[PDB]
Amino acid sequence: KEIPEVLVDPRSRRRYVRGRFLGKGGFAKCFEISDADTKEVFAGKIVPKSLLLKPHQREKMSMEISIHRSLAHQHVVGFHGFFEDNDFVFVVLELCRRRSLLELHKRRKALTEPEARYYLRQIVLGCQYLHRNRVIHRDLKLGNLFLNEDLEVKIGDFGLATKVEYDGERKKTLCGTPNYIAPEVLSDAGHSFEVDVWSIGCIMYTLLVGKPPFETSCLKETYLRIKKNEYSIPKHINPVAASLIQKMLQTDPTARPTINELLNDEFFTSGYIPARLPITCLTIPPRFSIAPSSLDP
Amino acid sequence: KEIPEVLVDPRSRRRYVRGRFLGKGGFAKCFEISDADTKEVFAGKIVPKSLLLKPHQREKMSMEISIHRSLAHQHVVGFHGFFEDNDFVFVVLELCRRRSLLELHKRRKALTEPEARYYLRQIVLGCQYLHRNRVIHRDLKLGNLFLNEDLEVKIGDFGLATKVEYDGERKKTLCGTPNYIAPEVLSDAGHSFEVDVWSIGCIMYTLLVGKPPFETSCLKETYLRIKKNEYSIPKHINPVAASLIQKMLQTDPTARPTINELLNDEFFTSGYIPARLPITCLTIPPRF
Numbered sequence: 388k389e390i391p392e393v394l395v396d397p398r399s400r401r402r403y404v405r406g407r408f409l410g411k412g413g414f415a416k417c418f419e420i421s422d423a424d425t426k427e428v429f430a431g432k433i434v435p436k437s438l439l440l441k442p443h444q445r446e447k448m449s450m451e452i453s454i455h456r457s458l459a460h461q462h463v464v465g466f467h468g469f470f471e472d473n474d475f476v477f478v479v480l481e482l483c484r485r486r487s488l489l490e491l492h493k494r495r496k497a498l499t500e501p502e503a504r505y506y507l508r509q510i511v512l513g514c515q516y517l518h519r520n521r522v523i524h525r526d527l528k529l530g531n532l533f534l535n536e537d538l539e540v541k542i543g544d545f546g547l548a549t550k551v552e553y554d555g556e557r558k559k560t561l562c563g564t565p566n567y568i569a570p571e572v573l574s575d576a577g578h579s580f581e582v583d584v585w586s587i588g589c590i591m592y593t594l595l596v597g598k599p600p601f602e603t604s605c606l607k608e609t610y611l612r613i614k615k616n617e618y619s620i621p622k623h624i625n626p627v628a629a630s631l632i633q634k635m636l637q638t639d640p641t642a643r644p645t646i647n648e649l650l651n652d653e654f655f656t657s658g659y660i661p662a663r664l665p666i667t668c669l670t671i672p673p674r675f676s677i678a679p680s681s682l683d684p
Numbered sequence: 685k686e687i688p689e690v691l692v693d694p695r696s697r698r699r700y701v702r703g704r705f706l707g708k709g710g711f712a713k714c715f716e717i718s719d720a721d722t723k724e725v726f727a728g729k730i731v732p733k734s735l736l737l738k739p740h741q742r743e744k745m746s747m748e749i750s751i752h753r754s755l756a757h758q759h760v761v762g763f764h765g766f767f768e769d770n771d772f773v774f775v776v777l778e779l780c781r782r783r784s785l786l787e788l789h790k791r792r793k794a795l796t797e798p799e800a801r802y803y804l805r806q807i808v809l810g811c812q813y814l815h816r817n818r819v820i821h822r823d824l825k826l827g828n829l830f831l832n833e834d835l836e837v838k839i840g841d842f843g844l845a846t847k848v849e850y851d852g853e854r855k856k857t858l859c860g861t862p863n864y865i866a867p868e869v870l871s872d873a874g875h876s877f878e879v880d881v882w883s884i885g886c887i888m889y890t891l892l893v894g895k896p897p898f899e900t901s902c903l904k905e906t907y908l909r910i911k912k913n914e915y916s917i918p919k920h921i922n923p924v925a926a927s928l929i930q931k932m933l934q935t936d937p938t939a940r941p942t943i944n945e946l947l948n949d950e951f952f953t954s955g956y957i958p959a960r961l962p963i964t965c966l967t968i969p970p971r972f
């Protein structure tokens with residue numbers, strides 16, 4: 388089944404022109420689309436209804452939309468609406484013109500500490516909003532931490548997300564395999580908000596070190612290292628940053644910081660956080676003083 | 685970790701006395717130092733080994749030294765040797781007593797055309813030597829164009845410099861952010877010797893106009909102007925000078941003059957070049 392050249396909404400009679408191809412997310416394909424009337428450009432997620440025939444996939448799609456449409460925060464990908472024809476489901480999302488932290492990490496590898504801190508603070512602010520709205524993402528990775536023109540982080544891809552119905556509710560079932568598998572998900576012990584802090588722990592490590600904390604050449608060794616909490620922080624990592632990674636990457640979920648305690652860590656409160664990053668930071672490391680002061684030209 | 689009062693070389697047993705503070709280059713600190721034996725005064729670059737613990741910083745430091753130690757030209761800062769203790773790396777460089785073109789430009793702003801031509805010819809001569817030795821500086825700015833007692837230009841600071849291994853090699857990765865970002869570096873398209881001509885273009889503009897060609901109050905507008913090659917030459921600039929700036933500041937790297945063609949421009953061949961500049965030119969405009 389071919390994808391339509393123009394995407395028409397039965398209800399609001401809104402019509403979008405299928406522009407540049409952006410990429411595919413497993414089962415879904417993503418295109419740059421523009422409203423023919425207003426000329427406003429969006430990120431169109433397009434899922435073949437042929438691949439939703441399995442009821443367990445319809446649950447996943449409906450749950451993703453239900454969660455994403457209820458969210459509105461400057462560090463969460465905007466949800467502008469959804470619709471369907473008889474062949475495809477169309478989801479209209481905020482366009483983040485600088486792709487995601489995955490593309491940045493592939494080009495730059497290890498970031499400077501101020502860059503890491505700049506990105507991580509926004510990731511935590513976004514996740515804080517989710518957790519306060521009783522949402523667990525359960526699949527935070529570089530690839531779904533999107534970047535807009537101003538290099539502001541936007542959390543997207545709620546494909547594995549669940550809503551907590553009461554305070555201390557623990558979940559078992561996932562409709563897919565998270566990128567950063569927390570030890571309580573691997574052991575099938577039940578999980579809550581703490582999985583998001585684990586993945587933020589893996590993300591922080593990757594940004595500062597330039598490679599993942601657990602990932603090896605084979606998944607069998609990868610998952611054994613996660614089970615036994617076997618990872619090594621290079622001595623070149625600063626003591627405050629090293630400390631915060633150790634807090635987040637703990638086997639005991641109750642031992643990890645909450646998202647509120649995470650934001651109030653010395654790493655953020657006592658560390659230099661740039662107000663802006665120059666656009667050159669996508670490809671080349673920026674200059675920072677040993678002791679940056681807001682009393683300087 | 686405190687910096688030693690006297691700097692001792694394990695090999696050669698050479699010993700220098702840490703004199704007047706000259707300034708800091710981001711991660712490095714620079715001091716006026718003198719050989720206790722010969723009394724010869726040098727510029728000592730001192731880098732804490734604590735800040736080199738990240739291997740990708742050790743590559744940058746070793747590459748800078750490797751390139752700089754292989755160079756010997758009257759328009760390139762002399763490299764007299766390097767050594768280390770367990771806490772610091774020490775690099776001994778030629779002392780340029782009149783600092784750099786940045787300090788001159790801050791005091792004088794727009795130079796006269798003969799002054800501009802005098803400085804630019806030496807900058808090009810230095811860069812010509814680099815390019816002939818398959819070296820791209822990639823960070824030429826007023827701040828690393830140093831001036832000796834006689835106001836002769838010396839190119840220093842090979843912190844972002846790379847050596848070209850083969851004919852037609854194009855480079856991607858920079859270990860820092862150049863002051864004058866060429867459009868092919870901004871677009872991550874690959875770059876070669878042409879970036880040096882771009883920066884010489886920006887430098888020539890700044891010397892004659894008294895402000896940078898692209899730099900605005902915000903970096904977002906600055907980088908958009910570079911991408912689209914949006915800049916304005918004041919009508920008061922002479923036509924031959926204006927022409928040469930237009931040749932160097934082109935988006936297409938292949939369209940720019942080479943460093944050899946640059947030197948043979950009408951601006952240099954047909955323009956008045958002073959043999960010397962008087963020391964008063966640091967603070968007040970000279971007569972010709």
Ligand SMILES: C[C@@H](Oc1cc(-n2cnc3ccc(CN4CCN(C)CC4)cc32)sc1C(N)=O)c1ccccc1C(F)(F)F
Binds near residue numbers: 533
């Ligand atoms: C299905 C798609 O969903 C999106 C897309 C979004 N998106 C918004 N603006 C964007 C600008 C560019 C890119 C391009 N992709 C290429 C692959 N890369 C790993 C991430 C950026 C994607 C952009 S947000 C969002 C979401 N679900 O919230 C998606 C989700 C997760 C990983 C990859 C994609 C996909 F590759 F398909 F794009």
Ligand SMILES: C[C@@H](Oc1cc(-n2cnc3ccc(CN4CCN(C)CC4)cc32)sc1C(N)=O)c1ccccc1C(F)(F)F
Binds near residue numbers: 729783839
């Ligand atoms: C790290 C240092 O390295 C040097 C220093 C050199 N140098 C030689 N004689 C000199 C007389 C005075 C001054 C002082 N600076 C103050 C700042 N100004 C922008 C330039 C002159 C520096 C002199 S040459 C040279 C080099 N790497 O080739 C350096 C490189 C680039 C910009 C600044 C400095 C630093 F500020 F640290 F000095």
Ligand SMILES: [Cl-]
Binds near residue numbers: 567
């Ligand atoms: Cl990992």
